Design a protein around this ligand. Structure first.
Ligand SMILES: Cc1ncc(COP(=O)(O)O)c(CN[C@@H](C)C(=O)O)c1O
Ligand SMILES: Cc1ncc(COP(=O)(O)O)c(CN[C@@H](C)C(=O)O)c1O
Lengths: 394, 394
């Protein structure tokens, strides 16, 4: 029945208003492969709103690996890994990932999102604590909400706040600290050296979400622990396959005893169907390419260094990024929606960040680089962004 | 740091004991496509533990549709539907599903699990209520736990308990009832006529999880509302693609205003990458086949009717199933593990249900039919199950 349900959704008017104003730019229907240019409404559009940092979703070797896995294994496994949904290739990918990030063991999940739900829901329980950076990804907040533990946010990269909040807690309790490696909003990197120094002092477990770090920082892109040399101080490395690795799914890697506990106790792996064969094979092939072909990471960072330099030269106000995410401040929700749609209509795709996710005065567009971007494409996009910022009176 | 973490996992010994006893049969690595026979350890094994009810994960047309989508769209969309992860084909599949289940609109999710997290987390909030059948799927309990509402379980298909618990609640509050359509443990069907009669009396929203119903019950397999004629009394129809539809992902269909609220407010769709092109195309092609080719559903039910008849004739104790899930009672965890492994070693794959998920005295194996099963295969499996139950002294 719909009476109260209709009242619950009645005040959600922003989409109706965006659409009526001709500003709506969510769920833009792409007609082509994710690439440096995409087709929308039959038009070519420069893509600066992707997470495919290495441009690998078009790599013919990865496509062929996926197509061959469809030929051999079919379209799906039709059950949880726990029961009838494990393939030899899922186990192969776990062993490969474990080697890549320097851990004993890994368990796959069908999404990155579910990869955070699993360890955050089941390791800390009643009388225990989870400590979260306040800017942690939504999947980390949700995973921690599924635990029976007490969840505590600390100030963004605020090690004094982290230390203070841990110091308060009963000694006879388990604690887990979970942090993004690279935070996606502002593109900044966790202070892992101090965070792990505090974790070591308080015997708290450390989990790092490397969704934006894998294929980006660390040796051969192995992520945030790898970038700092702190493999030995990080209990659990989580990653997704939907960004650099060009696929869908995720993992958690760690000590064989911890991973064996997760794979038999995490509801998001016991009660959800396993990764499709095609996504296992594309992740496997992408992982090989990232390590074997150093040029992809190198070119991502040449693009990043060039674009950031060009943006600061043109006087754009950037966030404190240390990554291929270039947050460009606009500081008005109305202007952020206008700039986003005007760019779309001039053939540039960027992602808006608005209230209520951020304060109006911190509203911004996110401009993300891919290894496959050319300097010519970057220059075109920035030329068009200078014009739209002028038109918009930012 | 690992001291307290090691203590949290220290008492989880069942896997170590199963493995040391030679009884472990979780995460069995399959080497071949999900089918009526699978290869494990280079041996052929009859598969009676699948959720691929129509056997479609091997359909060459569905494989080719997926391979063609890889060719056209690449290996992934590399972002949320909300931002850069929408394809024309995701929208096509939403329109197709909406038509199939008789609703205005649908939103895809990258897993079935996430399809329950979305509406349960974001529609009911503070001062509202979610009412859950006590046997609801784990993803429904977790989705409801992510809401800021008060979550209330009612007795399994206990309409007097449902009515009583609703009657207690403040009138000035929103209520949502969420139920599995077909419950996977015992294979039973929700009492949707009475549940919707109560929902209508109390103006409570109705959500049905049709993971095991789509491709199984209702006109041309359209699910539980379709089976009862109660499309008009069900607000939200959720489904997965990982069972009859031979793929990965899920959806929620409903009124265009409710679905537009979800697709902009559900964290599991705004903050998780979209379905892979290959899984969109396999779901599209599978959906066509289920409707165009009535023989698949017909043969599922001929197999179901035959196997259930043969099991009751041999004197097996079955659960109160109304579906292709044939729960066979064993009523000892030790015997359930022994029977499961002895079947595996004789070339039969079945799924155990044990403590702590059920009481020891309700432990069982689940024997699930596929349309592609032959009577000869069913007969072989039952002959082997009679022998193992004898060997096991059940
Ligand atoms: C009733 C029900 N709802 C929702 C889901 C989640 O759908 P996905 O597997 O597509 O995420 C399942 C999963 N079932 C299997 C996996 C199980 O519980 O073993 C289910 O049985
Ligand atoms: C830090 C972080 N962790 C985890 C996830 C979830 O991974 P999957 O998308 O593979 O489920 C994301 C998703 N990001 C994108 C989708 C976003 O938030 O728009 C993320 O940014």
């Amino acid at each position: 029945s719909k009476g109260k349900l209709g009242e619950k959704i009645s005040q959600f008017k922003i989409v109706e208003e965006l659409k009526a104003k001709g500003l709506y730019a969510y769920f833009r229907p792409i007609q082509s492969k994710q690439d440096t240019e995409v087709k929308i409404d039959g038009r070519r559009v420069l893509m600066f709103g992707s997470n495919s940092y290495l441009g690998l979703t078009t790599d013919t070797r990865i496509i062929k690996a996926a197509q061959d896995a469809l030929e051999k294994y079919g379209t799906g496994c039709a059950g949880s890994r726990f029961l009838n949904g494990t393939l030899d290739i899922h186990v192969e990918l776990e062993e490969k990932l474990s080697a890549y990030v320097g851990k004993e063991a890994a368990i796959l999940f069908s999404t990155g999102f579910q990869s955070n739900l699993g360890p955050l829901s089941c390791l800390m329980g009643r009388n225990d604590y989870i400590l979260l950076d306040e800017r942690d990804h939504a999947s980390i907040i949700d995973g921690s909400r599924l635990s029976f533990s007490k969840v505590i946010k600390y100030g963004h990269n605020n090690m004094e706040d982290l230390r203070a909040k841990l110091s308060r807690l009963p000694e006879d309790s388990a604690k887990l600290i979970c942090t993004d490696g690279i935070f996606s909003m502002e593109g900044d990197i966790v202070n892992l050296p101090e965070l792990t120094s505090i974790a070591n002092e308080f015997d708290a477990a450390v989990m790092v979400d490397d969704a934006h770090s894998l294929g980006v920082i660390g040796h051969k892109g192995a992520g945030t622990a790898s970038h700092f040399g702190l493999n030995d101080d990080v209990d659990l490395i989580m990653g997704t396959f939907s960004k650099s690795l060009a696929s869908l799914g995720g993992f958690v890697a760690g000590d064989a005893d911890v991973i064996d506990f997760l794979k038999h106790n995490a509801r998001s792996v016991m009660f959800s169907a396993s990764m499709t064969p095609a996504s296992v094979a594309s992740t496997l092939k992408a992982l090989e390419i990232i390590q074997n072909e150093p040029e992809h990471i190198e070119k991502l960072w040449k693009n990043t260094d060039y674009a950031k330099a060009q943006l600061l030269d043109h006087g754009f106000d950037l966030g404190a990024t240390e990554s291929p995410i270039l947050p460009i401040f606009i500081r008005s929700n109305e202007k952020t929606f206008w700039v986003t749609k005007m760019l779309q209509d001039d053939g540039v795709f960027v992602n808006p960040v608005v209230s209520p996710a951020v304060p109006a005065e911190e509203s911004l567009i996110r401009f993300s680089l891919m290894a496959t971007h050319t300097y010519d494409q970057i220059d075109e996009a920035i030329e068009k962004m200078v014009k739209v910022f002028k038109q918009a009176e930012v």
